Every structure is written in structure tokens, then in C-alpha cells.
């Protein structure tokens, strides 16, 4: 017949050592993706929480404070949580600065 | 009236 005369695909001589076929299972190994799957080790819903925390570590203090309990509604109305509430429409530039102000600024009733 | 007995 004719088996080794065709060279139109990956064959036994294209890989350097012909005996590597003995293992031939390392190709079908999914490598753990970089960040979130580090939490499954600790646990041995939680993995996604650790992904959120990992990517959430890249914040400034005030920026994170702004986004601590931030919730965005579908229609564009945004509610901001103070640790009062700052319910207002997003896409106007003033509301975010006002949340910043009441977050880091000083307010005193003074009797 | 509360004070329900067992």
C-alpha cells in the first residue's frame, strides 16, 4: 500500500522523538486561568467572589469607597451608598462629584 | 393572653 509516502498532515516523524506518543495526554490539559481559580485551592460562587476581589484590589481609597455599595439600575438611575443615599441619574457629570464631595468632604450640623 | 402553657 502507501501510508508513509503522504506528508499532508502531522505524522510520526514531524515530532522530534517518536516515543512521545507514549504519554500523548498532556495536550488535553486545561491550564488553570490566571487569577480567579487561585481561590479553589483555598476552598479545598466562591471562585467568582475571589475574582471580583482580585480585580477590585486595583482601586484608590476614595474610588473604592465610591464603589463599595454602588448599584447601577437598567434605566440609568444610579444609587450610591454612604457608609444617606445619592440616588440620581447617571451620565450627568455633577452627580459623581457630589458623591465624591459627600464621601470625602466634611459636613457638620453643629447644633 | 399569652403565657401559653405546654
Amino acid at each position: 500500500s502507501s501510508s508513509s509516502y503522504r506528508d499532508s498532515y502531522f505524522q510520526y516523524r514531524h515530532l522530534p522523538a517518536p516515543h512521545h506518543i507514549l504519554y500523548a495526554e498532556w495536550n488535553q490539559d486545561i491550564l488553570a486561568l490566571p487569577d480567579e481559580v487561585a481561590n479553589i485551592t483555598m476552598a479545598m460562587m466562591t471562585s467568582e467572589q475571589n475574582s471580583n476581589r482580585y480585580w477590585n484590589s486595583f482601586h484608590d481609597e476614595d474610588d473604592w469607597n465610591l464603589f463599595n455599595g454602588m448599584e447601577l439600575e437598567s434605566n440609568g438611575v444610579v444609587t450610591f451608598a454612604g457608609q444617606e443615599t445619592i440616588t440620581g441619574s447617571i451620565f450627568d457629570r455633577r452627580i459623581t462629584q457630589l458623591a465624591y464631595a459627600r464621601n470625602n468632604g466634611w459636613h457638620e450640623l453643629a447644633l | 393572653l399569652s403565657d401559653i402553657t405546654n
Binding site: 487569577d35 487561585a38 481561590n39 485551592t41 483555598m42 476552598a43 479545598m44 476581589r53 482580585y54 477590585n56 484590589s57 482601586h59 481609597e61 473604592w64 457608609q83 | 393572653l1 399569652s2 401559653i4
Partner: protein, 440 residues
């Protein structure tokens, strides 16, 4: 300043030390109290190895929490945890700067580590569900305890109408007393109110539906149409709906002097549960036939049919929050709480309740349901339709529980049972106005 990989430096922490470090309703509160004490103890007692380790930011508490074998911001994302040998750590110290003398100063008043102080000062979550014994019980001697009965009913005016024996009594929450309306020869089975508490539609044991006034304490009129006892009542702002043991499904248009408007006899056996849909012109019906029918308006044609029941079922009604969601109770041998969807023919849930179900109550601002029970365990079952998991179980009734209802605020719930007890629990809690506020 950076250690080599092939020749790592050894930390002071020993093999078995990591074995120690990695070791781990009022019961939940005590368990949380014990865990923070243990975490604080192992954090403070250890940490000299952890203090010598690390490169920047982070904390010894984070390192301990990362050891595998309202939240504030985590500093850094390193999850190295405990380790025998360290590569990065080569002894090095930052020069003293004004922040450091600020830091060593707030430390001078602290008898413990700053990290432990931050952990303790951090607020634990105050997230608990309180479903305990009733905080208030009143008097109602000689309460009816028949399976086809539904007596108590909420009204917006803090007013409860109860059929105690053969007389109708009125309980006012604002006053806490009992007021007698009237009495008759035949016992009452179903109670209802029309309008805004102006009228009280009551069903008797012979189907002789007589409307009694509340303020005037008089019988408004006397109707017929049922040759057997009424089982439950419902209404949507203009027409009362009555179901009875003799398969009668009577809709009464209270506008004209003869309220009787239409009748429906589409079931195979007796009708026991019948709650009209106030929002939409639909009706939910069922009984001991193991068959639940959904009608459109007053027409006799069953738009939807579902027959998953197996015994005498009394509890079926629409859920106010999500439209088309009908919850149906179980039976003596069925005991299946079944949640259904109208206009889509979809089974949302079907779960054993552990006992026969007789009545249901839906919350106001949450997806919490309470269901009555009888002839099997004489208890009450709490329900969460979103996650399908019971929360708490309420018991303590000499006779079976049949009558239930919701308060105005969604907090108080009432139970009706032959034990002559009313158990009250507490489970829950634009530029037009710009022009108004210009004048002050």
C-alpha cells in the same frame, strides 16, 4: 536583595507550626464569636515569621486567612499564606519617614498588633432571620376548626373579623379589644370584606350568603345559590366571588341590588379554595378533586388545568408580587407545595411540605411565604419561592391550623386554629413636589 531560587532561606516557622496555624439563632452568633477569637489568638501569638516575611502592604491576618489546609477593601491580592521557605525575603528595611512615626505613634497606645486591632474593629455582619415564638396572643374562644373553613381576614383599618362559634366578633389592633357584630342560627364558614372595610361579606354553613354591615352592625341583604356550605370568598373591587362544597362558583356583582352575576360548575368534585386575581381578570380554583383550574374572568371555561395533587387540598392563591404565579397546597397523602405559572403553563416548583396544606400568606416586600397545615402535624411552614428552601417552622396548636392572613406592613401574621389562640409573629419590617415646596 533578592534571594536565589535554588538556595531559599528558611523562615523560623516549623513543619508542625503550619499544622497548628491551618487548623480551624444564637448558635451562629456563638460560633462566629468563637471563630474571631481563635483567628485573633493565632494571629497575635504567631506573626513574627509573617512579620519577617512579606514584601509590601498586605497583612499577617490576610496571610493566615489565605492558608488553605459589609466587607472593607482588601490590601493587595497575594494569597501566599504560610510557607516553610521564602525566596523573595532578604532582610531589608525602609528608612524612617513621617508616616512611620505617625504609625508607631498610634501603635504606642495599642497593647496589641495594629492588624489585630483592625480585625477586631471591623464590624461583623448583623445578618440574621428572626422567626421565633409569637410576641402577642389574644383571646378567641370556640374557634371553628373545619377543613373547608377560612375565617380570619385582614383589613386596612387594623380590623379583624372572626367567626367565633355562631357569632361574628371584631378585634381592633389599635385598641386590643373585641367587638360583637351579630349572630345567627347556622355557623359561619367564610369571611370577607368589600370596598374599604365598608361591608363584610360572610358565608354560612348552608350557602346562605348574607352581607352584614360593619359600622351599622346590620344584615345588608340575604342571598342564595348554594345548597351546601361556603368554603372561601374573594373579590376585585366590584364583584364578590364565592366557592362552596356543592361545586358552586358564584360571582356576585354588588352593584345591582341582586348581586348574583354568574355561576360556574366546571370542576369534577367539591370546591374548597377560590381566590380571585385582583390585578387581572383571572381566577384560581380547586378543591378535593386534585384538580386546579384557572379561569379567565367570569367564564366557565378553564383556561389552565393542573392535576398534580393527590388528596384534599385547601390552599391555593395568586402571589401579589409576580403576576401569574399561583401557589397550591398539598393534601393529607399529597403534602406537596406546588408553585405554578399562569399564561405560560410552567411548573415553577413542586416540593414535599411534610404535612397537608390549608392556607397561604404572601409577604409584601420580600419573597417569603407561610403556609398553614392540618391533620398531619398541626404546624406552619415558611417558604422561599426563589431558592426553594424552608427557613423556620412554627408549631404549638392543639387543633389543626386553617386560617391565616397578612398584616398591612407585612410584619404581623395571624393563625387560626381550634386551640382558641391568635398567634402574632413579626417576620418583616420629580418636579411636581418642587412646586409644592416653594411656599413655606
Amino acid at each position: 536583595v533578592y534571594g536565589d531560587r535554588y538556595i531559599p532561606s528558611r523562615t523560623d516557622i516549623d513543619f508542625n507550626s503550619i499544622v497548628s496555624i491551618s487548623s480551624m439563632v444564637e448558635y451562629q452568633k456563638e460560633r462566629q464569636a468563637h471563630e474571631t477569637y481563635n483567628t485573633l489568638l493565632k494571629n497575635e501569638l504567631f506573626g513574627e515569621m509573617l512579620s519577617k516575611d512579606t514584601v509590601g502592604s498586605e497583612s499577617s491576618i490576610d496571610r493566615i486567612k489565605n492558608t488553605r489546609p459589609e466587607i472593607t477593601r482588601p490590601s493587595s491580592n497575594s494569597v501566599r499564606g504560610a510557607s516553610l521557605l521564602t525566596y523573595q525575603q532578604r532582610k531589608g528595611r525602609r528608612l524612617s519617614a513621617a508616616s512611620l512615626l505617625q504609625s508607631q505613634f498610634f501603635d504606642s497606645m495599642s497593647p496589641v498588633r495594629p492588624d489585630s486591632k483592625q480585625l477586631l474593629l471591623s464590624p461583623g455582619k448583623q445578618f440574621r432571620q428572626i422567626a421565633k415564638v409569637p410576641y402577642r396572643v389574644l383571646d378567641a374562644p370556640s374557634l371553628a376548626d373545619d377543613f373547608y373553613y377560612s375565617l380570619i381576614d385582614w383589613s386596612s383599618t387594623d380590623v379583624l373579623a372572626v367567626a367565633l362559634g355562631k357569632s361574628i366578633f371584631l378585634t381592633d389592633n389599635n385598641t386590643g379589644d373585641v367587638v360583637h357584630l351579630c349572630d345567627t342560627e347556622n355557623e359561619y364558614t367564610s369571611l370577607s370584606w368589600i370596598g374599604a372595610g365598608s361591608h363584610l361579606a360572610v358565608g354560612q354553613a348552608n350557602g346562605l350568603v348574607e352581607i352584614y354591615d360593619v359600622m351599622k352592625r346590620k344584615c345588608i341583604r340575604t342571598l342564595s345559590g348554594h345548597i351546601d356550605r361556603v368554603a372561601c370568598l374573594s373579590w376585585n373591587n366590584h364583584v364578590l366571588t364565592s366557592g362552596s362544597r356543592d361545586h358552586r362558583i358564584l360571582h356576585r356583582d354588588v352593584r345591582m341590588p341582586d348581586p348574583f352575576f354568574e355561576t360556574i360548575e366546571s370542576h369534577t368534585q367539591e370546591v374548597c379554595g377560590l381566590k380571585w386575581n385582583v390585578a387581572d381578570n383571572k381566577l384560581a380554583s380547586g378543591g378535593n378533586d386534585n384538580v386546579v383550574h384557572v379561569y379567565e374572568g367570569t367564564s366557565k371555561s378553564p383556561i389552565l388545568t393542573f392535576d398534580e395533587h393527590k388528596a384534599a387540598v385547601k390552599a391555593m392563591a395568586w402571589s401579589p408580587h409576580k403576576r401569574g404565579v399561583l401557589a397550591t397546597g398539598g393534601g393529607t397523602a399529597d403534602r406537596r407545595l406546588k408553585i405554578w405559572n399562569v399564561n405560560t403553563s410552567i411548573k415553577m416548583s413542586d416540593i414535599d411540605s411534610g404535612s397537608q396544606i390549608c392556607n397561604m400568606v404572601w409577604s409584601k416586600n420580600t419573597n417569603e411565604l407561610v403556609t398553614s397545615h392540618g391533620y398531619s402535624k398541626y404546624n406552619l411552614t415558611l417558604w422561599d419561592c426563589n431558592s426553594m428552601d424552608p427557613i423556620a417552622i412554627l408549631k404549638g396548636h392543639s387543633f389543626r391550623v386553617l386560617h391565616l392572613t397578612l398584616s398591612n406592613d407585612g410584619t404581623t401574621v395571624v393563625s387560626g386554629a381550634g386551640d382558641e389562640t391568635l398567634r402574632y409573629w413579626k417576620l418583616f419590617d420629580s418636579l411636581i413636589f418642587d412646586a409644592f415646596n416653594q411656599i413655606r
